[PDB]
Design a protein around this ligand. Structure first.
Ligand SMILES: *[C@@H]1O[C@H](CO)[C@@H](O)[C@H](O)[C@H]1NC(C)=O
Ligand SMILES: [Cu+2]
Length: 235
């Protein structure tokens, strides 16, 4: 159970973005229905009044929270991977538009899931803004909590993988457009019951055997990391 508070650009806090440049849902409940239109940008998908201005090669950091800024972030029980996608704002996220910029699942060396490292990073994870065409974009940050993912929601609606999805409105101002954005996957539609990494037993299956859902990260990406960039409590 987690939400996005706002973003930082190049280590500078852009301020509270909820319902301003983040298409915030009304609460921190997960999305579980893989076929639902809620899979695109969560349950209140509408244009919000501002977009954060960035340039290609900028570092964009999402900051998640549970109940209040810079708290426990997300329950430690919620092991799973993190991904970030981009689409043009003109799509409103409909069709084969979403391109993967970042994926983190299990780190064998540290023996930690992306979600565990996000708690240590005080809710912060980053991508580098790619050299795409200037204009308006949607950045979709997705946390997948796998603690009830031994079952499929489609078969048992009280269990299943839990999706914590947030969409930020980003305006890319300065870019040469040297890596124009390629065709994307649809949300809903990319994840199905047979997709690797949607049905997984984290209690019995070694985390080293986990494969994150396709698609793979775009070669044009520069992303990116889970790591604290700024101290919230100095503001
Ligand atoms: C899942 O979402 C689809 C498409 O919106 C819908 O038809 C179906 O009723 C949903 N399943 C449940 C259990 O609500
Ligand atoms: Cu939760």
């Amino acid at each position: 159970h987690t939400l996005v508070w706002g973003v930082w650009v190049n280590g500078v806090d852009q301020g509270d973005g909820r319902n301003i440049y983040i298409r915030s849902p009304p609460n921190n409940n997960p999305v579980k229905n893989l076929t639902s239109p809620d899979m695109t940008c969560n349950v209140d998908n509408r244009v919000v009044p501002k977009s954060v201005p960035v340039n290609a090669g900028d570092t964009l950091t999402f900051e998640w929270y549970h109940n209040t800024r810079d708290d426990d972030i997300i329950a430690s029980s919620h092991h799973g991977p993190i991904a970030v996608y981009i689409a043009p704002a003109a799509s409103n996220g409909q069709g084969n538009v979403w391109v993967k910029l970042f994926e983190d699942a299990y780190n064998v060396t540290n023996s930690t899931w992306a979600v565990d490292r996000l708690i240590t990073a005080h809710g912060q994870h980053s991508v580098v803004v790619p050299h795409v065409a200037p204009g308006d974009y949607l950045f979709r940050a997705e946390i997948i909590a796998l603690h009830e993912a031994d079952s499929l929601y489609s078969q048992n609606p009280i269990r299943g993988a839990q999706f914590y999805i947030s969409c930020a409105q980003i305006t890319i101002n300065s870019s040469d457009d040297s890596t124009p954005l390629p065709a994307g996957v649809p949300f809903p539609g990319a994840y199905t019951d047979s997709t690797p990494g949607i049905q997984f037993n984290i209690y019995t299956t070694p985390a080293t055997s986990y494969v994150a859902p396709p698609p793979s990260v775009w070669s044009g990406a520069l992303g990116g990391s889970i790591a604290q960039v700024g101290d919230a409590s100095l503001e």
